[PDB]
């Protein structure tokens, strides 16, 4: 824990080195403010210090039950010879089904807004701009796959 508690903290600060990931963090938080979706994946720093492995054991116990769990594989394996050797751990070790209420989630709010971190020293300035759209399951998700492909993209380095 302490070893890993340190590395993350070590990394937490280092994480300012790749600007890409950085702005996205801003990006979510500006749209989804007021929703757990809007929050740092690694989470804020002080928690990691404050973090204790009992609360883990909670979340260990909480969401690592089945049906939440899912297994797959591909290769020379077929199906049966998977399932037979799936069989019993993890038929099983439960891996349960009870509740964690159900299925705890909420539709998230969408924020017309702006965020700016102004630092003029750096040579370049990333930009991100977006609007919200349909969820995973939805008809139009594919209809908009192409518009992006059509409008395409550019980079310094192409031979185009």
């Amino acid at each position: 824990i302490e070893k890993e508690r340190d590395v993350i903290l070590q990394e937490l600060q280092e994480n300012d080195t790749s600007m890409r990931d950085v702005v996205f963090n801003y990006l979510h938080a500006t749209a989804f403010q007021g929703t757990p979706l809007a929050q740092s994946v690694e989470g804020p720093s002080e928690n990691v210090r404050k973090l204790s492995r009992a609360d883990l054991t909670e979340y260990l116990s909480r969401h690592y039950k089945a049906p939440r769990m899912v297994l797959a594989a591909a290769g020379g394996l077929e199906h049966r010879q998977l399932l037979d050797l799936a069989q019993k751990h993890f038929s099983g070790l439960s891996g349960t089904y009870d509740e964690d209420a159900v299925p705890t989630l909420s539709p998230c709010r969408f924020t017309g807004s702006q965020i700016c971190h102004r630092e003029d020293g750096l040579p370049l300035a990333h930009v991100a701009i977006a609007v919200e759209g349909p969820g995973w399951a939805h008809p139009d998700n594919v209809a908009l796959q192409v518009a992006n492909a059509i409008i395409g993209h550019y980079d310094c380095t192409y031979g185009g």
């Binding site: 924020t111 017309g112 807004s113 702006q114 965020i115 102004r118 630092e119």
Partner: protein
């Protein structure tokens, strides 16, 4: 020179704002605003009024001073002689 580009150099400032639709044209404009009207009005009225007094005083002061001086010929010299 180029107006927005090169003016100043600034680092590690952050700014937050919303769509104007996201918010209201009068967030307690009446209730919350009225005190703000009041508080600052005195900071000026200290230094504003005092002369305005002076004129209006002198205004009437001279006015009266003007009046009787003119208005009444048999004032000091009455019409016995």
């Amino acid at each position: 020179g180029r107006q927005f580009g090169h003016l100043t150099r600034v680092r590690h400032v952050i700014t937050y704002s919303l769509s104007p639709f996201e918010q209201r044209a009068f967030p307690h404009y009446f209730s919350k605003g009225i005190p703000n009207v009041l508080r600052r009005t005195r900071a000026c009225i200290l230094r504003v009024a005092p002369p305005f007094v002076a004129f209006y005083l002198v205004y009437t002061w001279g006015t009266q001073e003007f009046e009787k001086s003119k208005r009444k010929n048999p004032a000091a010299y009455e019409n016995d002689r």
